[PDB]
């Protein structure tokens with residue numbers, strides 16, 4: 001019944017598939033009898049974040065084993081897991097809290113997506129119904145267009161040497177514009193240094209990402225793992241962001257984003273720092289990597305500089321980063337331009 005293009009139709013089907021939501025939850029070890037998709041709520045994930053933040057402070061303070069156990073038990077009581085024989089992994093370190101926090105980041109977007117799906121008027125094709133739910137215009141970029149060529153070159157060129165486990169294939173290029181996002185970004189368009197950068201996420205998140213845009217982790221969330229504090233992270237290297245799709249031989253198709261990001265005065269940093277407050281004058285944070293995209297090969301797509309230069313070496317050898325990463329701490333500093341459907345070819 002829907003007049004929408006097949007790639008768009010196929011995209012709506014994909015980002016709203018309830019089975020891949022459950023499949024994610026199962027992989028996460030969650031008890032689906034006690035915690036089914038429906039019972040999953042914003043308030044419990046908020047509460048769970050808060051417990052993880054407590055576990056972090058308990059680790060920082062170097063609190064009692066009794067404390068860390070009761071704290072760990074409280075988390076698993078809130079987010080019921082099912083290991084069968086295996087005893088629940090004790091949350092008593094940075095990696096443990098970071099891990100569970102990232103799970104919650106995902107569960108939160110899953111809740112966003114499932115709620116969106118269940119909500120609204122219940123005629124009109126369901127694929128059309130759900131496309132409208134995303135409040136995002138999705139248009140297909142022609143395979144043989146100047147646009148597509150620029151994008152595919154950026155994908156080919158900024159594919160790292162280290163990420164040699166896969167080969168990326170651009171199945172579909174979508175030109176997207178989220179409802180009201182353009183007006184939101186318009187004041188930050190006045191800022192200098194507007195770059196077109198990569199953002200990779202699990203497919204289960206993309207309904208929420210298109211629905212509410214990219215967002216920053218709440219206050220409740222632990223500051224652990226966020227190398228440069230809670231903000232929106234980006235890469236000039238397709239590989240770096242493609243990693244975050246969590247693709248496999250099983251599910252080799254993943255989704256990536258191209259977004260206009262107003263960086264302005266970048267706070268160029270070598271090593272990790274949980275910022276919270278940026279220095280007076282600065283608008284973003286640039287994690288300086290040992291490998292930088294060729295600056296002498298920077299292109300200008302719609303008056304936005306695309307660093308599609310081949311992976312060359314940067315002068316900094318005294319850094320904890322292998323590649324460049326960019327962080328903004330105001331969600332309006334981003335305007336999403338493209339969504340790419342990539343096929344990961346493993347070896």
Ligand SMILES: CNCc1ccc(-c2[nH]c3cc(F)cc4c3c2CCNC4=O)cc1
Pocket residue numbers: 098099101102198199200201224225226227233234235236240241242244324325326
């Ligand atoms: C606890 N979770 C911590 C955490 C989770 C995700 C990210 C992150 N850093 C990035 C740097 C970068 F350049 C690109 C990306 C990311 C991400 C995750 C989001 N996607 C990116 O492509 C960073 C920290």
